[PDB]
Amino acid sequence: GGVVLRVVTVLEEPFVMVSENVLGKPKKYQGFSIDVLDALSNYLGFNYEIYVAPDHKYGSPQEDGTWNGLVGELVFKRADIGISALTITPDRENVVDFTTRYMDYSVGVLLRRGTSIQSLQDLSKQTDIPYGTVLDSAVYQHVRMKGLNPFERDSMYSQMWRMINRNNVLESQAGIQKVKYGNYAFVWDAAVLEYVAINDPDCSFYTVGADRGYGIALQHGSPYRDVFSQRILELQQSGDMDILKHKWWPKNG
């Protein structure tokens, strides 16, 4: 009778993916973050049940200072653990506690084959192909912060903020669909976009693009954080974290 921890997530390939099911046979989740979660579950002896953030968002600080999304679920005490493709950021570290990272994060751009965008810089220099990101996400917040900083050294960020300031989507799937079928470029996690590009049945895409990382979020003060971070470091040191990565990014495009 191990305690059942409530895990809040956002669906996002290949980090957390569902298998939908029929006739009362249980819905199951899989992916890189589920494997890491499982490695931790097996170690602490907890069970868990997963639910998706009700608003389908990662979360960002709102006009009135409250948090929504996955990060908000933690702040509002609705969950014990938050895990997805969740980017560790200083603003989020203000209201929840992150583990050490279990994988590096970077920003990429998903583009339709036949376009001629070779860099995030080129993308920002035009307005013809419209572009954007997922609302209430770390990308949105980062582009805003850098784009509004007069002392930012790369002028691309100000150009991006002009375009993005709410061209955005509610969920990454919508952004991917817009690139595929419309006239759009989608700015999102490189790890997600690499997986999407290499697995697209039509090879419709290419991508262009480690100072931030993916982390497990816990309520502030949680006694799981140190224990998790220890287990994460162990997994990295042994090569086991790399084995997990290769399972989900076996880069064979």
Binding site for Na ion (CB under 5 A): 93, 97
Asked if 36 is part of the footprint of Cl ion (rule: CB under 5 A), the reply reads no
**For residues 73 and 159, which CB has a smaller minimum distance to Cl ion in the complex?**
73
- Residue closer to Cl ion by CB (options 10, 79) is 10
Q: Position of tokens 């954007």?
A: 132
Q: Pick from 30, 38, 41, 56: which binds Cl ion (CB under 5 A)? A: 56
Report the alpha-carbon angle 233-234-235, nearest 5: 90
Specify the stretch interacting with Cl ion by CB under 5 A; choose among 6-14, 27-35, 101-109, 194-202. Answer: 6-14
> How near is the Cβ of 89 to Cl ion at its closest, in Å?
19
CB of 101 to Na ion, least distance (A): 15
Residue 160 burial (10 A CB sphere; 0-12, 13-18, 19+):
buried
Is 52 near Cl ion (CB under 5 A)? yes
Buried b (16+ CB within 10 A) or exposed e, 166-204: ebbbebbeebbebbbeeebbbbbbbbbbbbbbeebeeeb
Partner interacting with residue 97 (select from Cl ion, Na ion, none; CB below 5-8 Å by kind): Na ion
- Tokens at 4, concatenated: 């059942």
Q: Pick one of Na ion, Cl ion, none as the site partner of residue 144 (Cβ within 5 to 8 A by kind).
A: none
Q: Quick one: what does residue 226 bind among Na ion, Cl ion, none, with the CB cut-off 5 to 8 Å set by partner type?
A: none
> Among Na ion, Cl ion, none, what binds residue 10 when CB lies within 5 to 8 Å by partner kind?
Cl ion
- The site map against Cl ion for 67-106 (x = CB under 5 A) is ----------------------------------------
Name the residues that contact Cl ion, by CB under 5 A. 10-11, 52, 56
